[PDB]
Amino acid sequence: DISTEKTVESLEAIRHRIAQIVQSLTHFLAILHQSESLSPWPTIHKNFNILLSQIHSLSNNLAAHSHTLQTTSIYPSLEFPVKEQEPLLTTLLRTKALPEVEEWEANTLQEYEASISSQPKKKEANDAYQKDQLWDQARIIFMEERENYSWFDFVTRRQESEGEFVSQRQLEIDRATEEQNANQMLTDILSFMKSGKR
Amino acid sequence: SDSFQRQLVQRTNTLNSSIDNATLTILSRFQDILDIAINEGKDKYTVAPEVYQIECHTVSMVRAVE
Amino acid sequence: TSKLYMLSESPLSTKQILQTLHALNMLIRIRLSLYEIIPTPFQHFTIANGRCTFTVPNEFSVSLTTNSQDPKSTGISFQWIVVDFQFHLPDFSSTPAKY
Amino acid sequence: VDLTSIQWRMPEWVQSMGGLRTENVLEYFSQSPFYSHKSNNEMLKMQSQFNALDLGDLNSQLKRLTGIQFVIIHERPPFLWVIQKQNRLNENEVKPLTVYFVCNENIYMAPNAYTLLATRMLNATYCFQKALTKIEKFPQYNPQEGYTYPSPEDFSVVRAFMQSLHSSKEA
Amino acid sequence: LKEEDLQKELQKESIKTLDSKRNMDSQAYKKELIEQIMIAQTECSLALDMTSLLLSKFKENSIETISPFLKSTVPPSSLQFSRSQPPESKESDATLAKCWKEKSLTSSCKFLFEAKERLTSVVETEHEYYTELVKVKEASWPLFNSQGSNHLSVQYSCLGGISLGLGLIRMKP
Amino acid sequence: LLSKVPDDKSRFEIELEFVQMLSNPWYLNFLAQHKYFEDEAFLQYLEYMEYWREPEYVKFIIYPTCLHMLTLLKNPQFRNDISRADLSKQVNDEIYYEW
Amino acid sequence: FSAFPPPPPYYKLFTRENIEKVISNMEKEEIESLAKLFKKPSCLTSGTYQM
């Protein structure tokens, strides 16, 4: 029964995540409906982004509890039997893929069939592994290369760092002190005019 | 109201804020495409969100450039 | 549901559509001569090519000028049983164009 | 043949025997693609030829036997029954390999939570990718005009019309 | 439609593969979008409801998460779950996944190419317009951004007089 | 671009049966849900189905409906509405009544 | 829950590109000949009745 309660807390977590994404999707729907003309690309795009963050969190939860979720299986019984007469159950627990998805899959598999027309299959899997390796290498060298540069400076490339140096805050401090001393010059000349202090 | 110099520095800090924000989203988006480009775990259900993410990130990159 | 979603064959005989137009104009004459109510400013009308046309002097670089002819099937002759009324269909000319 | 998406039943069989019973639920199962003919219940059916039996005998001989077995997990007489494809290598301990669903003279797969939630997520994803791919090509960007998707005098012309209309409506 | 034009066309007509071969609204794109997100929302809402039913058998947390229509229609503690064995993985399924990601990357890099090309056209026109503005202010005519915040306006009434008149430069493309 | 793998006799047996499928409204509904109407290749294949109206060929077809169905499907708005379940039932019921 | 057979794969074959390639074939007068063999409707006279 320990496995059962672990699956309980797990599916609790996924329930919370899917709840939040329902709320975000309904919000999106509302903003869409709010204006008769379609909404401005900046805002809709922003909402696509939040949607992405939600679905990413969900996929992480599912892969983390993937073992405990594929061992467990769901059948209705006992208390649903009062409403058991209805086909709502079959529609609710159905795991048929969407028709668009289903076709999609079929088409992509046909494409693989053109590819096998091109070449033999045994060679394909090792090449695939080698590529995944490639991508991981590209990732780490990009991290290094990026950490190498400097970003939030004014004209301060690597090359320009060798060249010269430019300071915004020093300019600002400079102008500030110049204006303050200039003001003291003012107050001094004003007291001179009023009553000689030359 | 704010000083004249306050106005100037206000502006530049604004233009920066906006501009390092845009560059930083270019970097970070490309980075995260890369983080997602490997297909080793290859749970087809995980691969499909990944595809969405890829599309959404590239578009976010062009957005930043604009 | 067939008749609403039905669609005719794509050929339209252009000699036919002229003859439709003739019979249509002619049929607006029928209607109008025995249409019950004309407003007196409308008393002069031209049965145009395809169209009924109506002119009343006006400003803003145009005359108040409307063109009517109609698509309701049921009435076409029943338009005369319905001397009271009719679907008519317009096409009015001013100096603007889109609006 | 994918066994999980599909929904099967044989009302002809049910009417042939008559009403829906415990034992007839297991026979009905025997007719379904879900049942496997190498099953232990099938080996028992082969061993006895047109004689009476008993149900307590059925479970007790299921445990006595070692291999793939189909038993009743929960039973509700009016409409629905619950079957599982449990595999016991030894008695008193069983590893359930599949669960199976019976409802209104219908047999169903009753699948694993992971595949349900996963497929759901996959649908949602697909909707997203399609909508975004349709939108992304459309909008236009000019840098001075902004983002575009492909006068007050005229507005006053409209006001004149709507007011004319309101007048005619009131009349 | 004119009778003379038509008598000309029809008079011109009197002069005259077995397979038949034949070859949008912002509101329309809008409809497509809301359609798609709506189908997503109905799918996710379904999953939400089902999970909520089960957990509501085992927690307060999911009487909340289940929809009011569904909780009104069906008694709580309805669904069940038992340990079972996960299904055999399909070779076609994984080869599918890999095919999907590869196509995804190629799609992305192509999109970056074309986006670069269109933005280069954009920057080209921009460069044109601004070289002409530079030409203008090189002649010491003041200019101010227009009220619409698109383009810029020159102050032709800058030599003198009472009224102040300014007008925006636009590219007739 | 996989090489075509068809059979001569078999594909006229098959194209006959496919026309028959087109007679069924529920098959049209599923077809629309699967967004087969999104593909232009499909629509050209429909015109290829026009060969089945020819007398020697139509002499073979069993269910007349398909022919009508085919002309019905030439309107695209009809295609999106046979995606709809309600209209689907309307069509089925309309045959059922004629029958 | 209910399902029917998909149409022939060669529906998926059609493109207006290959169509234009076969009208170019017509203009000239392997692949093209296979396309026109595909486009003819060769009816049958006698001998087959089953589904």
Curated annotation (Swiss-Prot), chain B:
Keyword Transcription regulation: yes
Gene Ontology molecular function: transcription coactivator activity
Keyword field: Activator, Nucleus, Transcription, Transcription regulation
Record's keyword annotation contains Nucleus: yes
Coiled-coil intervals, chain numbering: none
Subcellular locations according to the entry: Nucleus
GO cellular component term of the entry, any: mediator complex
A single BP term in Gene Ontology: positive regulation of transcription initiation by RNA polymerase II
Summary of the function given for this chain in its UniProt record: Component of the Mediator complex, a coactivator involved in the regulated transcription of nearly all RNA polymerase II-dependent genes. Mediator functions as a bridge to convey information from gene-specific regulatory proteins to the basal RNA polymerase II transcription machinery. Mediator is recruited to promoters by direct interactions with regulatory proteins and serves as a scaffold for the assembly of a functional preinitiation complex with RNA polymerase II and the general transcription factors.
Subunit structure as annotated in this protein's UniProt entry: Component of the Mediator complex.
Family note: Belongs to the Mediator complex subunit 22 family.
Protein name, UniProt field: Mediator of RNA polymerase II transcription subunit 22
Gene: med22
Residues of the full protein shown: 3 to 68 of 136
Curated annotation (Swiss-Prot), chain D:
Entry keyword set: Activator, Nucleus, Transcription, Transcription regulation
Transferase is among the record's keywords: no
Subcellular location(s) per record: Nucleus
GO terms for cellular component: core mediator complex; mediator complex
Name this polypeptide is given: Mediator of RNA polymerase II transcription subunit 6
Function: Component of the Mediator complex, a coactivator involved in the regulated transcription of nearly all RNA polymerase II-dependent genes. Mediator functions as a bridge to convey information from gene-specific regulatory proteins to the basal RNA polymerase II transcription machinery. Mediator is recruited to promoters by direct interactions with regulatory proteins and serves as a scaffold for the assembly of a functional preinitiation complex with RNA polymerase II and the general transcription factors.
Subunit structure: Component of the Mediator complex.
GO MF, one example: transcription coactivator activity
Species of provenance: Schizosaccharomyces pombe (strain 972 / ATCC 24843) (Fission yeast)
Coiled coil region boundaries: none
The family this protein is said to belong to: Belongs to the Mediator complex subunit 6 family.
Presence of the UniProt keyword Transcription in the record: yes
UniProt cross-references to PANTHER family, sorted A to Z: MED-6-RELATED (PTHR13104)
Main location: nucleus
GO biological process, one term: positive regulation of transcription initiation by RNA polymerase II
Source domain of life: Eukaryota
UniProtKB/Swiss-Prot annotation, chain F:
Keyword Transcription attributed: yes
Subcellular location: Nucleus
Keyword Aminoacyl-tRNA synthetase belongs to the record: no
Keywords noted in UniProt: Activator, Nucleus, Transcription, Transcription regulation
GO cellular component: core mediator complex; mediator complex; nucleus
Main location class: nucleus
GO molecular function: transcription coactivator activity
Gene Ontology biological process terms, A to Z: positive regulation of transcription initiation by RNA polymerase II; regulation of transcription by RNA polymerase II
Source species, domain of life: Eukaryota
Membership in a protein family: Belongs to the Mediator complex subunit 31 family.
Described function: Component of the Mediator complex, a coactivator involved in the regulated transcription of nearly all RNA polymerase II-dependent genes. Mediator functions as a bridge to convey information from gene-specific regulatory proteins to the basal RNA polymerase II transcription machinery. Mediator is recruited to promoters by direct interactions with regulatory proteins and serves as a scaffold for the assembly of a functional preinitiation complex with RNA polymerase II and the general transcription factors.
Subunit structure: Component of the Mediator complex.
Protein name per the record: Mediator of RNA polymerase II transcription subunit 31
Lineage, opening ranks: Eukaryota, Fungi, Dikarya, Ascomycota, Taphrinomycotina
Entire-sequence positions represented here: 6 to 104 of 139
Curated annotation (Swiss-Prot), chain G:
Signal peptide start-end: none
Compartments in which it is found: Nucleus
Assembly and interaction partners: Component of the Mediator complex.
Family: Belongs to the Mediator complex subunit 7 family.
Protein purpose: Component of the Mediator complex, a coactivator involved in the regulated transcription of nearly all RNA polymerase II-dependent genes. Mediator functions as a bridge to convey information from gene-specific regulatory proteins to the basal RNA polymerase II transcription machinery. Mediator is recruited to promoters by direct interactions with regulatory proteins and serves as a scaffold for the assembly of a functional preinitiation complex with RNA polymerase II and the general transcription factors.
Protein name: Mediator of RNA polymerase II transcription subunit 7
UniProt organism field: Schizosaccharomyces pombe (strain 972 / ATCC 24843) (Fission yeast)
